[PDB]
Design a protein around this motif. Sequence first.
Motif, PDB file in Angstrom:
ATOM      1  N   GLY A  31       4.879 -16.738  -4.891  1.00 26.82           N
ATOM      2  CA  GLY A  31       5.129 -15.884  -3.746  1.00 26.82           C
ATOM      3  C   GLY A  31       4.405 -14.555  -3.868  1.00 26.82           C
ATOM      4  N   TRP A  32       4.031 -14.211  -5.097  1.00 26.10           N
ATOM      5  CA  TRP A  32       3.325 -12.967  -5.366  1.00 26.10           C
ATOM      6  C   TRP A  32       1.811 -13.118  -5.315  1.00 26.10           C
ATOM      7  N   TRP A  33       1.321 -14.351  -5.365  1.00 27.41           N
ATOM      8  CA  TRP A  33      -0.119 -14.570  -5.343  1.00 27.41           C
ATOM      9  C   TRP A  33      -0.769 -14.130  -4.033  1.00 27.41           C
ATOM     10  N   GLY A  34      -1.839 -13.352  -4.154  1.00 30.24           N
ATOM     11  CA  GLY A  34      -2.574 -12.902  -2.987  1.00 30.24           C
ATOM     12  C   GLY A  34      -1.948 -11.840  -2.107  1.00 30.24           C
ATOM     13  N   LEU A  35      -1.205 -10.914  -2.703  1.00 29.28           N
ATOM     14  CA  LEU A  35      -0.606  -9.836  -1.929  1.00 29.28           C
ATOM     15  C   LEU A  35      -1.736  -8.886  -1.537  1.00 29.28           C
ATOM     16  N   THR A  36      -1.621  -8.266  -0.371  1.00 24.40           N
ATOM     17  CA  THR A  36      -2.633  -7.319   0.078  1.00 24.40           C
ATOM     18  C   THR A  36      -1.935  -5.981   0.276  1.00 24.40           C
ATOM     19  N   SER A  37      -2.712  -4.932   0.514  1.00 23.59           N
ATOM     20  CA  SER A  37      -2.145  -3.600   0.717  1.00 23.59           C
ATOM     21  C   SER A  37      -1.220  -3.576   1.932  1.00 23.59           C
ATOM     22  N   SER A  38      -1.439  -4.523   2.844  1.00 21.50           N
ATOM     23  CA  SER A  38      -0.658  -4.635   4.077  1.00 21.50           C
ATOM     24  C   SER A  38       0.600  -5.490   3.948  1.00 21.50           C
ATOM     25  N   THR A  39       0.573  -6.466   3.042  1.00 20.90           N
ATOM     26  CA  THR A  39       1.716  -7.352   2.835  1.00 20.90           C
ATOM     27  C   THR A  39       3.016  -6.566   2.848  1.00 20.90           C
ATOM     28  N   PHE A  69      -1.300  -5.220  -8.568  1.00 23.93           N
ATOM     29  CA  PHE A  69      -0.400  -6.042  -7.771  1.00 23.93           C
ATOM     30  C   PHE A  69      -1.092  -6.969  -6.776  1.00 23.93           C
ATOM     31  N   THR A  70      -2.349  -6.697  -6.462  1.00 28.32           N
ATOM     32  CA  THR A  70      -3.068  -7.556  -5.530  1.00 28.32           C
ATOM     33  C   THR A  70      -3.876  -8.561  -6.329  1.00 28.32           C
ATOM     34  N   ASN A  71      -3.753  -8.504  -7.650  1.00 23.19           N
ATOM     35  CA  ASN A  71      -4.470  -9.424  -8.524  1.00 23.19           C
ATOM     36  C   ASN A  71      -3.552  -9.960  -9.607  1.00 23.19           C
ATOM     37  N   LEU A  72      -2.261 -10.013  -9.295  1.00 24.34           N
ATOM     38  CA  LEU A  72      -1.262 -10.503 -10.234  1.00 24.34           C
ATOM     39  C   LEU A  72      -1.604 -11.880 -10.780  1.00 24.34           C
ATOM     40  N   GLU A  73      -2.058 -12.770  -9.907  1.00 28.33           N
ATOM     41  CA  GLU A  73      -2.401 -14.126 -10.319  1.00 28.33           C
ATOM     42  C   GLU A  73      -3.460 -14.182 -11.411  1.00 28.33           C
ATOM     43  N   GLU A  74      -4.468 -13.324 -11.324  1.00 32.50           N
ATOM     44  CA  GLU A  74      -5.520 -13.324 -12.330  1.00 32.50           C
ATOM     45  C   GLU A  74      -5.121 -12.534 -13.568  1.00 32.50           C
ATOM     46  N   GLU A  75      -4.109 -11.682 -13.434  1.00 32.47           N
ATOM     47  CA  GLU A  75      -3.664 -10.848 -14.548  1.00 32.47           C
ATOM     48  C   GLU A  75      -2.339 -11.256 -15.169  1.00 32.47           C
ATOM     49  N   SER A  76      -1.766 -12.359 -14.693  1.00 33.53           N
ATOM     50  CA  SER A  76      -0.489 -12.841 -15.211  1.00 33.53           C
ATOM     51  C   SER A  76      -0.480 -12.969 -16.739  1.00 33.53           C
ATOM     52  N   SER A  77      -1.459 -13.687 -17.283  1.00 33.59           N
ATOM     53  CA  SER A  77      -1.555 -13.895 -18.724  1.00 33.59           C
ATOM     54  C   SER A  77      -1.818 -12.608 -19.515  1.00 33.59           C
ATOM     55  N   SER A  78      -2.200 -11.537 -18.819  1.00 31.89           N
ATOM     56  CA  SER A  78      -2.469 -10.249 -19.465  1.00 31.89           C
ATOM     57  C   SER A  78      -1.227  -9.817 -20.238  1.00 31.89           C
ATOM     58  N   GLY A 116       0.797  -1.213   0.000  1.00 33.34           N
ATOM     59  CA  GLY A 116       0.000   0.000   0.000  1.00 33.34           C
ATOM     60  C   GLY A 116       0.831   1.265   0.000  1.00 33.34           C
ATOM     61  N   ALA A 117       1.785   1.334   0.920  1.00 35.30           N
ATOM     62  CA  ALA A 117       2.658   2.489   1.023  1.00 35.30           C
ATOM     63  C   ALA A 117       3.411   2.673  -0.289  1.00 35.30           C
ATOM     64  N   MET A 118       4.029   1.590  -0.759  1.00 38.59           N
ATOM     65  CA  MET A 118       4.820   1.572  -1.995  1.00 38.59           C
ATOM     66  C   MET A 118       4.058   2.082  -3.218  1.00 38.59           C
TER      67      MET A 118
END
Length: 194
Positions: free
Chosen positions: A164-172, A103-112, A72-74
């Motif tokens: 390792g990137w799957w499911g990152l949250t604003s807090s991660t 970035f919090t939906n990288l897994e669903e957007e990977s193929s994008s 989130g900060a980043m």
Amino acid sequence: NVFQPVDQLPEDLIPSSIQVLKFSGKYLKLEQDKAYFDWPGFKTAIDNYTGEDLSFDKYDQSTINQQSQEVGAMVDKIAKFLHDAFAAVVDLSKLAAIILNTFTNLEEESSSGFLQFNTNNVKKNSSWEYRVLFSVPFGDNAPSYFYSLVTTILITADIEEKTGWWGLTSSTKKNFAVQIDALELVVKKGFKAP
């Protein structure tokens, strides 16, 4: 496709803004089966441009060393940067949310077509390149004009696996490194891609 298009333009400019996308798209360099944007190629291509509906305004680049912080900060920092360095996305309805969502939906957007993953076996870490293209108008005082901000965001973290990137949250929280590349162009209605 190659760039996530983020438009906030009046319909009479959207066609021109798509041409900009078409133009930007043709500078992706495929190799090692990993697609990355070709900045030298792109910069060079703009110089050689001999048209009238396109001009270079400014190019900016911010690279920050690996620092442990939350997502989130980043993202907020990345957004603040794009806000302060250009006139293009000054009133864009919080690009920070657009970026935090990617970035919090990288897994669903990977193929994008606008995201490219990668790992470094030596440094045992990984990164993602987010390619985004912003377009906002000058105003009704100059109806034929708008800005296009060709942007690439390269996030690097201490994460070995792609999962390792799957499911990152604003807090991660991780040891993130960020490299932002952005070029601002002044383009006017009627711009066709070379």
